[PDB]
Symmetry: D3
Subunit: 246 residues, 6 copies
């Protein structure tokens, strides 16, 4: 009737194998010791934030799955916010486990979810490492925008660098894909780039290159696919599953 933590981890890693993760990505077990324990309640979150972790404790979550890792940069002192987070997780024996870029890259992962939403014709990986998707959007720019506003984020920032003809090349990248080097790279591959976390220098670069950029936010472009992932888990596992920051 009940699942062990290691069995949940096994199921997740079958869906999104850890070796799909890009170099250096802190995927896998973040916080935990005994993985033979039976799990009462699974929580899903975009971020292992202090609010999310307090909510997990509040809601009786003992297996906390997040997309973003707890720490990118390693530390050797435990004070302030990280102290408050670890204290809640350790005192309550809550396991924290992450699937980050392996969940972005895998089949039916976060980037596939976007490609399917826009029904990309002949989709291909955007980067060599498997991040992102690119293909033809069979419709007008205005229809593309409507889908974006309806399903992802209502007031996306649009950098309308040039006019966009019907049946354009659409690149999608869930999360933060709007770095300067990404703008330069994707400008060679697509007419329109849908992603998150636009900043000023990247906006200027897109305008110079004629790449239309749509910032539908880091949060919404990932949560769209995370919601799919949650349904997938719910359909397949005999486990109570809740979302914490979406």
């Amino acid at each position: 009737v009940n699942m062990k933590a290691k069995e949940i981890i096994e199921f997740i890693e079958t869906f999104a194998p850890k070796d799909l993760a890009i170099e250096g990505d802190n995927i896998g077990l973040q916080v935990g010791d005994n993985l033979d324990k039976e799990i009462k309640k699974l929580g899903i979150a975009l971020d292992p934030s202090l609010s999310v972790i307090k909510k997990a404790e509040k809601e009786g979550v003992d297996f906390l799955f997040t997309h973003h890792p707890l720490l990118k940069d390693p530390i050797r002192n435990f004070t302030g916010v990280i102290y408050k987070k670890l204290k809640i997780l350790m005192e309550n024996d809550i396991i924290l486990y992450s699937a980050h870029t392996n969940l972005d890259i895998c089949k039916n992962g976060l980037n596939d979810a976007l490609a399917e939403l826009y029904n990309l014709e002949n989709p291909k990986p955007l980067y060599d490492n498997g991040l992102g998707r690119v293909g033809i959007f069979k419709g007008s720019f205005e229809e593309f925008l409507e889908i974006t506003k309806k399903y992802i984020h209502k007031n996306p920032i649009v950098v309308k660098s040039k006019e966009v003809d019907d049946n354009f090349k659409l690149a999608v990248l869930s999360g933060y894909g709007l770095s300067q080097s990404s703008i330069k790279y994707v400008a060679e591959k697509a007419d329109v780039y849908l992603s998150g976390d636009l900043t000023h220098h990247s906006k200027i670069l897109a305008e110079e290159l004629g790449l239309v950029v749509v910032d539908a936010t880091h949060y919404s472009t990932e949560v769209f696919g995370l919601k799919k992932f949650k349904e997938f888990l719910s359909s397949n596992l005999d486990l109570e599953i809740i979302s914490l920051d979406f």
Copy 2:
């Protein structure tokens, strides 16, 4: 009648180059003969392709920008950088930048923000001299109204906690909302006004209880740049126009 070198001298008197932080690519970006006579000065935030085309169109012969032309060095000349350099060289337009030295100098871009908010006892925010922090003598709502009226009509507010009157306000013009900046400024201020907020930084601010106001990179720098432009206009017998503001 003014030579390019005396415009440069005037600017460098206001914002000495050694105020720029280590590694900042400040000073002459593109140019050769600085004895050249300058009839029309253009000021811009960005040396973008459209700014450079506009410079050429308006007959600008000295183009001042806040952001340097290149941050990372290159050794091939194709695409966008080719198009930009071709316009500058073809018209012998001098391109000169004052970047963090203009952020840091007295009455520079960060001081302009500190003065707008009338910060009491203002101090540099970082050791390298970037940013300002001091007491805002008023309510958070009064601080917001000033922001909306003079800087940006609808800033993003990450309202991480309640803010009492006479709070500590830190300001940094441009991009000051990196993850390490959020962590640092959270120890020094109740409210942080800057530009270019992204997701991980928003989350950090909420965790730390630092209220962040993103009035955009563009608007927080342009506010002080306009003041810098009027200063140049008051002191130089030169036609001076702005190109991207």
Copy 3:
């Protein structure tokens, strides 16, 4: 009535200022959040080992002072031994604070304690960074060994590289001072080197250089001064103070 964690820390840092610590040394607060909390029982240990931390919990220690830091190398995952250690400290809100090389180097610190035991004439810092002491031992090698056996370690390992005349130059370094580069450096400054943690290649180097090495162990050469430090805290603070691994 009770003193706060921050005033215990202030007292310690007055004796051994953090800026005395050598470059890269992970000194100061290791684990903790609220330093305004009141402290009823201070525990002192050489090592923040798992057994020391369990003993702290068992004995009701709320402020754990150790000489060695919890971590030298930073981490970004929390499992196994470090998980168990942090869990005990955090669930019980035990503060862990360390003074490492700043306690080695400061006046009347661990190296001064050794120099004073041997009544070194005109003692000087051994290294430029302030680690270790060197001066004249006004007596015979045999008298020096008897002092070592009575006060530090009952059976020290002696690498008797050459004969030692009376009134020789003695270098002392508490803890691990017997690295290969230290042997070479100290051989130019002393006839006899008293420290801890001898290994094979260092023994050979000492023999080649004619440097007499006395390994009284890493543990005993630090514990000697740590006891002095504990007495000093006990004399000055109105606090219950116990030792955990000595």
Copy 4:
């Protein structure tokens, strides 16, 4: 005689000297240019994209400037002085500047092969692992080797005569700068005589210690020999006016 698009010239050149033959880090390919559909009437070839070469190109109506050496080895982020003057000339005239560097040194019938064939090296092999240089037996006397050097490459090469050289010796050749201290040490294990360019003092001393005979026929002349072969090759195959600018 007809006009060619710039991209068609680049294609031909890269067929002869593929870019993936260039050693790690070498800045080969398009140096300065945007539109490669540009129509080319006159191709200029040079060893160096020097200021005098580029001025000569402008003067002579060159539309496509090929050089062996890249314009920049180390990247820059300011454009003043000499580089400003060079770019201004190239951009004002939209002259394309393209380079094939070590990929031209290494390819079949490239600059090093040209030397190896000149000396009729028996069973020639690549000298370095990366494919630079050639080494094989010279079937003749040291004096005959020197005469060949004098007749075809450079009239008065500097000879570091570290030891006597017997007939049928192992000869290593490297066009351009091949006389670094580390090259001397490496080649001394592989050859009796080393023909290259740009000898300096420490390298001379090292060669004398190791007994390696070094012949400095100069960086310029050892590359220009093969570059002339390359120019002749282009002229035979392309219906283009082709001129040389610094040789």
Copy 5:
């Protein structure tokens, strides 16, 4: 029967037994000091360390080829004074060749780690590390029997960190030389119940106790000399050459 050998023939024989490509990355194996390898060799000396006393003893005993396990230098130098001056002077004055097989001798079949694995009759032995250093397998006996073997054949009073109880038929890891660094302790704690090696220091002792890994320090010197004696016997059996040991 007893004859002279050229140095290159000795080197070829040693490298057949312990190929240089077995040595781990960065290990300074091979020719340490020497020029002409056609040199005729009458007397081969074997040592753990190319120490000053070993090199003096080599000179005194007329050793023409000095084999050592540890290389003369780990870190490169560009000045020649003090002890290294004294050492090189003795070798060069007498043209004594100094040659080393270090981790290639640790790793090769019947090398120093195999010697330990065979001594403890390890069941189904495997390399302990990826690079081939060390061996690990089941010790078919009690911990006390393991300890008895250690005391009789390796070192009489080994330091024992008895982090936990050890049942019969436990997993034993062995590493000849210095194998008791902190990172080795952490690594081996996942692969064995008991770790036999040398050069224990305080931090490593604490870590072993935390992890429950039983550590036996039978010393760097003795855990290598055990296999080096085997190696010497092997050379003596195969080469018609006078062979002596210098620091064992």
Copy 6:
């Protein structure tokens, strides 16, 4: 004289702290510095032929400008074996003063500045390497001095015309790196140094810097001869030169 006293005299003239970062100056090969020295040899290079000659002529202390090794080693075979064997077997001390001798007062760069009688000489680089000042004469007069005192057939890169009373930079040894050409072109009309190579020649032409390559060997040996005379005037020692 003891070796340590010779070393003391040299280091008083050319303190080791004047040497640039990373320069391997001081004792190269030696143990006992109480050794009695009857005969001192001076050389530019501690080459194998110099070291053989030192042995042949009975030299006890070998002073060289260039250090024995720039890059460290951990094996001793081939040429370095042969060199060390000669020095150690004979306990010949090898000691070097390299850039500290280039930089010190009346050192190798000052020797050149004094030969050309440079007006108001200044160090060329911040680290003290090289000298620059006005040459009070014609380019042709400068060339004549160069040919008579330094090197008979210097290579001249005549990048532009040179007027009388021009700014002259001098650097003994290897001063013609690409980065040096660019730097010096801002500070001088004419650059006198050694070891010219192709790319540096092209840069000098582009920049209009006249470069005179009087060779690495001759521009250092000129000042080394002066140093040898200075040692000879002051020390009661037999002193010979080995590669000049």
